[PDB]
Amino acid sequence: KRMDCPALPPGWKKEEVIRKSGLSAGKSDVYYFSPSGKKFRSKPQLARYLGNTVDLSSFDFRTGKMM
Amino acid sequence: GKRMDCPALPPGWKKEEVIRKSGLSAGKSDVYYFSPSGKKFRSKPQLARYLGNTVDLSSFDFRTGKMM
DNA sequence: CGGAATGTAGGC
DNA sequence: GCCTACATTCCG
Known part of the structure; x- marks a missing residue:
């Protein structure tokens, strides 16, 4: 169940x-x-790889959605 | 970490x-x-559920390990 | 999957 | 507004 995560940039998947x-x-x-x-x-860990390229402040890691 | 004996509880109980x-x-x-x-x-x-009626914890101050 | 380490809802 | 109590993360 490696599904596309529309809240992150293209190619990013969630399991x-x-x-x-x-x-x-x-x-x-x-x-x-x-x-x-x-x-x-x-x-x-996710925030470190991406750094300033993506604002993850609102990112809910468990559901993969912005709050 | 240091596990301190808790004199107020039964023998062997310790606090950290x-x-x-x-x-x-x-x-x-x-x-x-x-x-x-x-x-x-x-x-x-959690502690009261474990000990049951072996000890009365009504006055037990969890933070300090002291009966009040 | 465990569990130390930390987040956090709700009672006060 | 702070603390209790327990929920959850985060890395091993």
């Missing part, structure tokens, strides 16, 4: 992956993919 | 206070308790 077991069973992890295919696991 | 290093609440602290087996507790009701 949500369900945790299958343990204490956090049924919660999920959200990942982003740049055009090259770099995997990003957090909003600060 | 951790300073937040960054973010909005930087400089504030969080207090945690540990059972003698080492399970971590983060609030007074």
Whole structure:
């Protein structure tokens, strides 16, 4: 389920992956993919790769949408 | 981190206070308790739910570990 | 997936 | 406006 994320620049994808077991069973992890295919696991990490090129202040990392 | 015995609780219960290093609440602290087996507790009701009627926590000050 | 580290809603 | 209590992130 690597789906296009319309809130980021073209080529950027989003994946949500369900945790299958343990204490956090049924919660999920959200990942982003740049055009090259770099995997990003957090909003600060994403903000660092992009820097001043994209304003992520309103960006909701979990849903992939601007608030 | 230092785990301090909490004399006010039953034998073996310990307390730790951790300073937040960054973010909005930087400089504030969080207090945690540990059972003698080492399970971590983060609030007074969590601690009350675990101990049940073995201890009365009505007067227990979570922050300081002191009965008031 | 865990869990230290931090965010944050709602009671006060 | 601040704190309690618990929700959630973020990196290992």
